[PDB]
């Protein structure tokens, strides 16, 4: 019956755990006992981007590290100019319950989505002087949580249903569908190699997928739901944040946890996680109106980016690595340097 | 100290700012409401009777205007049972219209207790509707199903003096109604700071006074907020 299947699954899990323990021979904390400390790092606000009405939920930097896009619950996507604090585009949306946005790697398209279970693709450079809807992807049954671009004709989506999807813009169908989760998948990050990508769901489990194969390859298992995930700049490790006030750093080749970032004075959860250009600083936003910077080699706090009023929702770092963009539920955007 | 195109870009940005400012008066003059409920409750009946004035969409929107003020009503119809992550979007909603079917009650009590004690859902008021009051009278009159079987504390209850029934039908129906009403208000009572209150009502799926029932509650909420702001309460 099902009893033999359960016994076989338990035996397989025990064997995998034993093998993973056998492959562990040292702790990175012991090794990292000679590197000089990063030292106290001070950061100051440079610009303040005002103009939104309701709370801001997501943002994404551009490829040229000059333009950025922001999404609000008032039903607005605003494209800013970081250097001079201007306003280029003020796209109004149909449904005012958006939860994600994405900026194309070439600068020609923008994407949005939310509770409507529809991904909208907007075109920026057109013959006329207005932005119009180009495609309305609709094949999901839950709520969109994150969207990312691979090329100008490929997009990857994550939904409230325990599925992920790869789409084709020209046709409007689903080329590949990934399944295997149990809870809601809420974050999605892409590797620089463009071949692999990670996913994090509300089951205390992180997964790695293959775009061409369409099948899972790894599974990493945290105590509560996972809110954010991000790749290491090398491409062989990643970081995850949860609601238990901890941050974890996993390595793909070793397939085992490496470090834990937590402190006894931290009770609220983590919402956004990002790295730096050199992969030395880990910036994480928390629910207690503050944001912390960790040295991802010794698990020691260094500097706080205080200055917001309500919860911090979004956080990003430019490709050129010259600024950090932070948003919150106070309808404000801050640029730190 | 600017070039020829920088000044035009600044002018365009100021025009966008003017458009955004003109797009603000329409926002604060409109009130939004979140309408929850179970499956057996008369949710669809209320939505259909509010109309006096696309196959997988996850949200539905309703517009209605009373007393020269217009409202927005939202209802979810395509999500999954788990709802601990998309309920955080509604933190700037004037009120939550809960609907309970009196004819499964403990599940509604647990849902109300969970919503009332949420961290991000504070400062949000709840308008309670106890729908399907016609069938309750017939059920209690029939006598085939006793309420004491599911609730043991029903015996040690008395009709309160402040209770005033409009129609002269029966006292037992009033006792049964006010038992449930007090059971619901007991959860709301165990709170502090007076940030959010409860507004129970006895309504049916066919009643045509629901629009004014919401209007009065919204007016009371706004008036209490303004009074508390100016140190008058």
């Amino acid at each position, epitope marked *: 019956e099902l009893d033999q299947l359960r016994q076989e699954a338990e035996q397989l899990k025990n064997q995998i755990r034993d093998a993973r323990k056998a492959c562990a021979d040292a702790t990175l904390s012991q090794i990292t006992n000679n590197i000089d400390p990063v030292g106290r790092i001070q950061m100051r606000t440079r610009r303040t981007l005002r103009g939104h009405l309701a709370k801001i939920y997501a943002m994404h930097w551009g490829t040229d590290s000059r333009l950025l896009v922001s999404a609000s619950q008032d039903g607005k996507l605003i494209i800013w100019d970081s250097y001079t604090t201007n306003k280029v585009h003020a796209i109004p949306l149909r449904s005012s319950w958006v939860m994600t946005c994405a900026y194309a790697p070439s600068g020609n398209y923008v994407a949005c989505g939310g509770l409507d279970n529809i991904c909208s693709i907007y075109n920026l450079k057109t013959r006329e002087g207005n932005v119009r809807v180009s495609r309305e992807l609709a094949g999901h049954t839950g709520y969109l949580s994150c969207c990312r671009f691979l090329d100008d004709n490929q997009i990857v989506t994550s939904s409230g249903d325990t599925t992920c999807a790869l789409w084709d813009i020209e046709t409007g169908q689903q080329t590949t569908t990934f399944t295997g989760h149990t809870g809601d998948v809420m974050s999605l990050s892409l590797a620089p190699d463009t071949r692999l990508f990670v996913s994090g769901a509300c089951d205390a489990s992180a997964k790695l997928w293959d775009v061409r194969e369409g099948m899972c390859r790894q599974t990493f298992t945290h105590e509560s739901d996972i809110n954010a995930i991000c790749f290491f700049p090398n491409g062989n490790a990643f970081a995850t944040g949860s609601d238990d006030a901890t941050c974890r750093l996993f390595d793909l080749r070793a397939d085992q946890e490496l470090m834990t970032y937590s402190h006894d004075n931290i009770i609220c959860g983590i919402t956004s996680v990002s790295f730096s250009k050199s992969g030395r600083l880990l910036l994480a936003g928390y629910d207690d109106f503050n944001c912390n910077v960790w040295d991802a080699l010794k698990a020691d706090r260094a500097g706080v980016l205080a200055g917001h009023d309500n919860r911090v929702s979004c956080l990003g770092v430019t490709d050129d690595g010259m600024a950090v963009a932070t948003g919150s539920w106070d309808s404000f955007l801050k640029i730190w340097n | 100290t600017l*070039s020829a195109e920088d000044k035009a870009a600044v*002018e365009r940005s100021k025009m966008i700012e003017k458009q955004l400012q003109k797009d603000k008066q329409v926002y604060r003059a409109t009130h939004r409401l979140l309408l929850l409920g179970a499956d057996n409750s008369g949710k669809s009946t209320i939505v259909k009777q509010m109309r006096i004035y696309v196959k997988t969409s996850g949200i539905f929107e309703t517009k209605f205007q009373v007393d020269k003020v217009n409202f927005h009503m939202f209802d979810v119809g395509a999500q999954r049972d788990e709802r601990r992550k998309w309920i955080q979007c509604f933190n700037d909603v004037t009120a939550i219209i809960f609907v309970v079917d009196s004819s499964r009650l403990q599940e509604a009590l647990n849902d109300f207790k969970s919503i009332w004690n949420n961290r991000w859902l504070r400062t949000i008021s709840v308008i309670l509707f106890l729908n399907k009051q016609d069938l309750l009278a017939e059920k209690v009159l029939a006598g085939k199903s006793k309420i004491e079987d599911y609730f043991p504390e029903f015996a040690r209850y008395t009709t309160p003096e402040d209770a005033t029934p409009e129609p002269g039908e029966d006292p037992r129906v009033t006792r049964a109604k006010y038992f449930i009403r007090d059971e619901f208000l007991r959860i709301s009572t165990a709170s502090g700071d007076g940030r959010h209150y409860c507004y129970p009502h006895f309504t049916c799926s066919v009643d045509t006074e629901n629009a004014r029932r919401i209007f009065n509650d919204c007016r009371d909420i706004i008036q209490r907020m303004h009074l508390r702001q100016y140190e008058l309460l």
Partner: single-chain antibody
Amino acid sequence: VQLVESGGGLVQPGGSRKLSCSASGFAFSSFGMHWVRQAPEKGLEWVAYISSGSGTIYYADTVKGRFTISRDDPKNTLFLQMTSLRSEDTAMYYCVRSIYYYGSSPFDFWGQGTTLTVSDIVMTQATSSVPVTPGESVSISCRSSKSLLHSNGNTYLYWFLQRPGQSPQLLIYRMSNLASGVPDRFSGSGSGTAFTLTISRLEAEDVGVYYCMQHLEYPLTFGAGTKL
């Protein structure tokens, strides 16, 4: 997109005339508009400019107090009133559109134009005519009175080509970027005062006149031009 001009004709000196450019196929409300006049055999000139929202006005020095410009957004029309017409206003007029933001391409479309008959920074590109056979590369040079580079990093150099028989078109803007419908065969370069435009492979439809433009200052000067 369509931009059609109405007006023109022959007028005695000292009269008054109305010229109207009407647009169709694009959002007129978000585009600034200029006016460019061409003498029968003498270069190009800038005479008037209106911005988006009707908040800013500019005129030329020779028409500072005789011409007036206006637009009607709901009717999607622009028009200018000309008074005290001398013998210098016998020319062909074009209504050109431009939009200004980060990454935009001003002067992206020109109209047919209408003819009318009456009964600062200086550029020298006096290379006259350089005839050439089809198949080999060419090069056109240009010099500016003052350096056009600014502290923002840009250069503000524009190139234009007019085929014989129709309106001109845009080729290169800001001295480095390439237009939309033009091929990759054209290329451009410069250093601040000396600039050049190069065609590696020439085809039989490349005959015409080549002009230039600066946009560092509101007084706008084109140049003499060059013929192939």
